[PDB]
Design a protein around this motif. Structure first.
Motif, short mmCIF file in Angstrom:
data_model
loop_
_atom_site.label_atom_id
_atom_site.label_comp_id
_atom_site.label_asym_id
_atom_site.label_seq_id
_atom_site.Cartn_x
_atom_site.Cartn_y
_atom_site.Cartn_z
N UNK A 109 -2.45 27.06 47.71
CA UNK A 109 -2.15 27.29 49.06
C UNK A 109 -3.51 27.21 50.05
N UNK A 110 -3.67 25.88 50.80
CA UNK A 110 -4.78 25.56 51.51
C UNK A 110 -4.83 26.55 52.78
N UNK A 144 -5.80 29.14 47.75
CA UNK A 144 -5.41 30.49 46.66
C UNK A 144 -3.93 30.09 45.95
N UNK A 145 -4.22 29.70 44.78
CA UNK A 145 -2.83 29.26 44.30
C UNK A 145 -2.35 28.36 44.94
N UNK A 205 -8.36 19.78 54.72
CA UNK A 205 -7.10 20.71 54.38
C UNK A 205 -6.06 19.62 53.88
N UNK A 206 -5.69 18.42 54.47
CA UNK A 206 -4.72 17.61 53.85
C UNK A 206 -5.15 16.94 52.70
N UNK A 260 -4.46 19.39 49.71
CA UNK A 260 -3.00 19.49 49.55
C UNK A 260 -2.53 18.19 48.70
N UNK A 303 -5.91 28.42 56.16
CA UNK A 303 -6.35 27.81 57.61
C UNK A 303 -7.91 27.62 57.76
#
Lengths: 263, 123, 131
Positions: free
Chosen positions: A17-18, A14-15, A63-64, A67, A20
């Protein structure tokens, strides 16, 4: 059909920001079989032991990966890793790894051949670079990581197979012939096949043992009939008193059967 | 030296620093507490030479690095400034805590996100 | 007995200079890729041997090891079973063995996995010594 094992891992931003969360959908011979998230794994029970560990691994690692993408375009973005392995009738294996961004493919690896491939497309190529750079240099993946990915997947498939969760059970069709009544001294004859698995069926009217063209016949779609079975029908228009000249012919799983019109 | 500097029994010892890894997912705050509960603290990275086996750590783990927002930069719990050139900091998730990841990366996370953690005590 | 205070802190038993010490075992990871045979030699060159996994409890740090590394596991065709350098049988429940390549050697990978590889394939390795 071959045996399919597939993992569908998914992470969100979201904008930039990964979040959780993440979500893996596991499909066994093409049927949904597991849904894991960060918390734990749920079939559709602590035999979901090794998969909780493994798939949380990939989730974190993915997730990494997200990013390191520089889209920055505001709001909600998805990233996906889809691992697929197949065991073919002939004992040869198939295996691939795919990445989708906002639900569009941008990177594949054939795991049999180890050959990467991208769309030709400005955004598609920059994305692919972002993630291939993260894979080589930062994550520090050896050629051996991709051999393991391939092997991990297949031993898993062979393990599920062995356990006896997969039933290649044939369900042969119920057949019924029927007739639509006199309009201008003609009848429609309908052949119906229902409650049958697998999906693949041959169904055709014949005149004096010879198939009618696809054109002088009218066709049902193969619709679901419940429990994982299917139903379909084929129909043709004929003259009153040409009835026992016509029969409905059907192949399903090496069963070649023939049903005449009820006279 | 044939003997590794004094460490808790059942802890990892590398060049007289002591380490342990914890699978029990906790937010950063609970993790720091846990490490200090064991006469330790969340991993501090001070040297690529003395902590080179941090290159072989799988996945990501809470680490003792925080963003004091009016400081406009990262430091360790104890107040030590981060050495430049040691860590590559990546923006993953909006937050003022960092996860250690292998080849000396720090991924920024929300402190309230439960995660595995690494305790270290310096010799 | 349970508490971690400076009184209860031990030295970690006799280990080569600059090695990892955990529960009276010494470990070192080598980034210089070698075939299994050259790797075995390298470990024995240091009065050590390739990694043996004997206990999930005493070697639990093996759960955090990234990538794949030679370990002292070898095949025996008459028995159709795996054992360690020291002739020890593999404990039946310890390792999950995955058939990755045709070979008679295995790579350690994290979550107590053993991936079967050709012994002639250069790869990183882990030496272990009992304290």
């Amino acid at each position: 059909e071959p045996h399919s094992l597939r993992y569908n891992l998914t992470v969100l931003s979201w904008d930039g920001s990964v979040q959780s969360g993440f979500l893996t959908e596991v499909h066994l011979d093409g049927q949904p079989f597991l849904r894991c998230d960060r918390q734990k794994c749920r079939a559709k029970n602590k035999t979901w032991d090794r998969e909780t560990r493994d798939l949380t691994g990939n989730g974190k690692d993915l997730r990494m990966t997200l990013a390191h993408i520089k889209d920055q375009k505001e709001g909600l973005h998805s990233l996906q890793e889809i691992r697929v392995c197949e065991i073919h009738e002939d004992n040869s294996t198939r295996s691939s790894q795919h990445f989708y961004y906002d639900g569009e493919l941008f990177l594949s690896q054939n795991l049999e051949t180890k050959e990467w491939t991208m769309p030709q497309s400005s955004r598609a190529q920059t994305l692919a670079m972002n993630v291939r750079n993260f894979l080589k240099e930062d994550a520090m993946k050896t050629k051996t990581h991709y051999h393991a990915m391939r092997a991990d997947c297949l031993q898993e498939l062979r393990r599920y197979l062995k356990s006896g969760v997969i039933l290649r059970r044939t369900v042969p069709p119920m057949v019924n012939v029927t007739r639509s009544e006199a309009s201008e001294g003609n009848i429609t004859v309908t052949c119906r096949a229902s409650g049958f698995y697998p999906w693949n069926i041959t169904l055709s009217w014949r005149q004096d043992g010879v198939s009618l063209s696809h054109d002088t016949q009218q066709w049902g779609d193969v619709l679901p009939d419940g429990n994982g079975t299917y139903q379909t029908w084929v129909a043709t228009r004929i003259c009153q008193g040409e009835e026992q000249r016509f029969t409905c012919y059907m192949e399903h799983s090496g069963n070649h059967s023939t049903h005449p019109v009820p006279s | 030296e044939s003997y590794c500097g004094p460490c808790p029994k059942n802890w990892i010892c590398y060049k007289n620093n002591c380490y342990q890894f914890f699978d029990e997912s906790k937010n950063w705050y609970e993790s720091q507490a846990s490490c200090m509960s064991q006469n330790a603290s969340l991993l501090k990275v001070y040297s690529k030479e003395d902590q080179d086996l941090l290159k072989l750590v799988k996945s990501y783990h809470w680490m003792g690095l925080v963003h004091i927002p009016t400081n406009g930069s990262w430091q360790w719990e104890d107040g030590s400034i981060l050495s430049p050139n040691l860590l590559t900091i990546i923006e993953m998730q909006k937050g003022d805590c960092a996860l250690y990841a292998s080849s000396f990366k720090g991924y920024i996370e929300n402190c309230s996100t439960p995660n595995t953690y690494i305790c270290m005590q310096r010799t």
